[PDB]
Design an enzyme around this catalytic site. Structure first.
Site, PDB file in Angstrom:
ATOM      1  N   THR A 114       0.808  -1.214   0.000  1.00  0.00           N
ATOM      2  CA  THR A 114       0.000   0.000   0.000  1.00  0.00           C
ATOM      3  C   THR A 114       0.844   1.267   0.000  1.00  0.00           C
ATOM      4  O   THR A 114       0.323   2.340  -0.320  1.00  0.00           O
ATOM      5  CB  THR A 114      -0.939   0.011   1.205  1.00  0.00           C
ATOM      6  OG1 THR A 114      -0.174   0.129   2.411  1.00  0.00           O
ATOM      7  CG2 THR A 114      -1.750  -1.271   1.254  1.00  0.00           C
ATOM      8  N   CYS A 115       2.127   1.173   0.349  1.00  0.00           N
ATOM      9  CA  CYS A 115       2.969   2.364   0.384  1.00  0.00           C
ATOM     10  C   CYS A 115       3.219   2.922  -1.010  1.00  0.00           C
ATOM     11  O   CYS A 115       3.365   4.139  -1.172  1.00  0.00           O
ATOM     12  CB  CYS A 115       4.296   2.054   1.073  1.00  0.00           C
ATOM     13  SG  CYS A 115       4.152   1.608   2.815  1.00  0.00           S
ATOM     14  N   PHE A 116       3.277   2.057  -2.024  1.00  0.00           N
ATOM     15  CA  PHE A 116       3.587   2.483  -3.382  1.00  0.00           C
ATOM     16  C   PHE A 116       2.521   2.072  -4.390  1.00  0.00           C
ATOM     17  O   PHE A 116       2.784   2.120  -5.595  1.00  0.00           O
ATOM     18  CB  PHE A 116       4.946   1.925  -3.818  1.00  0.00           C
ATOM     19  CG  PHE A 116       6.021   2.074  -2.783  1.00  0.00           C
ATOM     20  CD1 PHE A 116       6.658   3.289  -2.598  1.00  0.00           C
ATOM     21  CD2 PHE A 116       6.399   0.998  -1.999  1.00  0.00           C
ATOM     22  CE1 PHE A 116       7.647   3.429  -1.646  1.00  0.00           C
ATOM     23  CE2 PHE A 116       7.387   1.132  -1.046  1.00  0.00           C
ATOM     24  CZ  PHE A 116       8.012   2.350  -0.870  1.00  0.00           C
TER      25      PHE A 116
END
Length: 639
Positions: free
Chosen positions: A611-613
């Protein structure tokens, strides 16, 4: 050998060796830093950059030793050097560890293997601005071989920094929070009328475009559900785990049999059972009149709702009237009130909520809400009543939260992977300890917290400072850090919120849903457009828009219904909403980041998402029939 040197004119050859870093400042706990030195050769008077190089990054070391050399062909009368020590592991907090500027007029000349080896020179690091904590020294060896202020903000504004290390600007005039630095010209004569009103209407249109899920002899133990398939043989399905059975689990369990039917997680059928369970308690005044003003939609509502002694009155029909409005409650005032009030409640200006570390849209409980607001526990109970009021009446809220927020309402245990959406910098460092050996970090079972510039030591467990973490006790260390950082510091607010929420809906009736489906219950299903989604995707690791797998992936997304597409959107991007402009403005951990599909792993493994990228790790499946079978499982199973 060249080292980005110069030529032509008239100058001398300067050899500069970076030896090591001494006592480099620490920003994050665990001492996880990846310092690297950027060398810039420029002109003092012209302020013009001529050459730029960098040194290799040394990972996880507060006293690195680069021991590298560079050469520059410049004159000692007009050129200067700037050595800036930066960090790599930082994602949200500033990565500036220091800077040193050096002239060249007074540097000795000595070719190697000629005289005695001169020692290593130490230079004190200096901050680039006022908001830069630096400490330590940089080790230099420079010689010549060849014989031959914060800008003033507009009034009513102040610059704050949240606990995630980011800086946001707060305006005290319109009570709004923004990330971009305010302009010198306030122009608060046309901006509010011709932008805020238009944006208010633009946001209002999207809020009306989101459809609710329902727009298509005791109780069972929590998490269970009863359904009736064909032939009328009623069966019971346990949403906890994935087991289902014909027998009634209401203490009528003398034997365990599970032939039943294949598991079918139907969100629509969950709500239909959920709606049939709500009741109207005895005699209630079948009206609830509130006279509210749009400018004071938050203070007037708080006084009215919190003045109700018995919450059973709220369960009656809502009748909201605004001043100077001779209209009718055709669902145009109850839903409007839940939208106007939602902006005030879920507003980071009041300090109750703050944005997450994975984007700028989702909200999380601000740990410092007690400091920002003295009555934080009172407001969160009020938010619990309003949030619990929307679910009871089947309305919608204009507010989204992070995944761990919904776990707390369901009372689930927060694991290491749940901190990915809370503190991205913490998640990467903690996950590194889980895999790699934390012996080299020399960490102890203690923490060092700084309060108002004062460093205090806190023991995670008794006699913590004298206990060393190793490869055996690291998992114990990870759990305590999660508790000390996130779980314990927002537990007081969550209990206050849950107390209000349970005043309308019993907590056992909401555990049927999971942390993904519960978000769509209070907010409602969105409108995901694949055509816009597909045009703004990035493929890496050999994938191309013409690749057969990518064609097979997008054909699978079209076949999925409205609910499944949103769950895929939650699975990758971490939220069920898209930016107002569209998918071209998806935000990652440290800035904008488009949806990404990457080849990864082996065909038998399931897809994974970061979910970070906004990254999806899609293995190279051989056949389309195989890809869709496993893509659905990853979306439905993984949470």
């Amino acid at each position: 050998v060249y080292g980005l040197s110069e030529d032509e004119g008239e100058s001398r050859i300067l050899r500069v060796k970076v030896v090591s870093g001494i006592d480099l400042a620490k920003k994050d706990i665990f001492g996880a830093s990846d310092p690297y030195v950027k060398l810039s050769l420029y002109v003092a008077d012209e302020n013009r950059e001529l050459a730029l190089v960098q040194t290799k990054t040394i990972k996880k070391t507060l006293n690195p030793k680069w021991n590298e050399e560079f050469y520059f062909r410049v004159n000692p009368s007009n050129h200067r050097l700037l050595f800036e020590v930066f960090d790599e592991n930082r994602l949200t907090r500033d990565d500036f560890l220091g800077q040193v500027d050096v002239p060249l007029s007074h540097l000795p000349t000595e070719d190697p293997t000629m005289e005695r080896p001169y020692t290593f020179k130490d230079f004190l690091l200096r901050p680039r601005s006022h908001k830069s904590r630096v400490k330590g020294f940089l080790r230099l060896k420079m010689a010549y071989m060849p014989k031959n202020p914060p800008p003033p903000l507009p009034p009513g504004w102040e610059e704050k920094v949240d606990n995630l290390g980011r800086t946001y600007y707060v305006n005290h005039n319109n009570r709004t929070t923004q990330w971009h630095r305010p302009s010198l010209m306030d122009v608060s004569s046309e901006s509010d009328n011709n932008i805020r009103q238009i944006n208010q209407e633009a946001a209002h249109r999207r809020f009306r475009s989101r459809r609710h899920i329902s727009e298509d002899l005791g109780p069972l133990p929590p998490g269970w559900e009863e359904r009736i398939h064909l032939d009328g043989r009623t069966f019971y399905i346990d949403h906890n785990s994935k087991i289902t059975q014909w027998e009634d689990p209401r203490l009528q369990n003398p034997a365990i049999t599970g032939p039943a039917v294949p598991y079918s997680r139907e969100f629509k059928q969950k709500y239909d059972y959920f709606r049939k369970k709500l009741k109207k308690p005895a005699d209630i005044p079948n009206r609830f009149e509130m006279k509210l003003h749009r400018n004071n939609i938050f203070e007037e509502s708080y006084r009215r709702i919190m003045s109700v002694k018995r919450p059973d009155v709220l369960k009656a029909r809502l009748w909201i009237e605004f001043e100077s409005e001779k209209g009718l409650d055709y669902g145009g005032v109850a839903r409007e009130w839940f939208f106007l009030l939602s902006k005030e409640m879920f507003n980071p200006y009041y300090g109750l909520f703050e944005y997450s570390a994975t984007d700028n849209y989702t909200l999380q409980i601000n740990p410092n809400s007690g400091l920002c607001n003295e009555d934080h526990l009172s407001y969160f109970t009020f938010i619990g009543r309003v949030a619990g009021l929307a679910v009871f009446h089947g309305k919608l809220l204009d507010g989204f939260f992070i995944r761990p927020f919904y776990k707390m309402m369901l009372g689930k245990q927060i694991t290491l992977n749940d901190m990915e959406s809370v503190d991205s910098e913490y998640y990467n460092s903690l996950k590194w300890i889980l895999e790699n050996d934390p012996t080299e970090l020399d960490l102890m079972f203690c923490i060092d917290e700084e309060n108002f510039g004062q460093t205090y030591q806190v023991d995670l467990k008794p006699n913590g400072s004298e206990i060393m973490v190793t490869n055996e006790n690291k998992r114990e260390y990870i759990d305590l850090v999660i508790q000390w950082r996130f779980v314990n510091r927002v537990q007081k607010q969550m209990n206050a919120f849950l107390e209000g929420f349970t005043e309308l809906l019993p907590i056992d009736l909401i555990k049927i849903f999971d942390e993904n489906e519960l978000e769509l219950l209070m907010c409602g299903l969105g409108d995901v457009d694949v055509n816009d989604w597909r045009q703004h995707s990035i493929y890496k690791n050999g994938y191309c828009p013409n690749h057969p797998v990518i064609q097979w992936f997008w054909k699978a997304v079209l076949l999925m219904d409205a609910e499944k597409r949103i769950r895929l959107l939650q699975f990758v991007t971490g939220t069920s909403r898209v930016p107002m402009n569209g998918f071209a403005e998806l935000y990652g951990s440290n800035g904008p980041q488009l949806f990404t599909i990457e080849q990864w792993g082996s065909p038998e493994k399931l897809p994974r998402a970061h979910t970070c990228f906004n990254r999806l790790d899609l293995p190279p499946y051989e056949t389309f029939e195989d890809l869709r079978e496993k893509l659905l499982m990853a979306v439905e199973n993984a949470q």
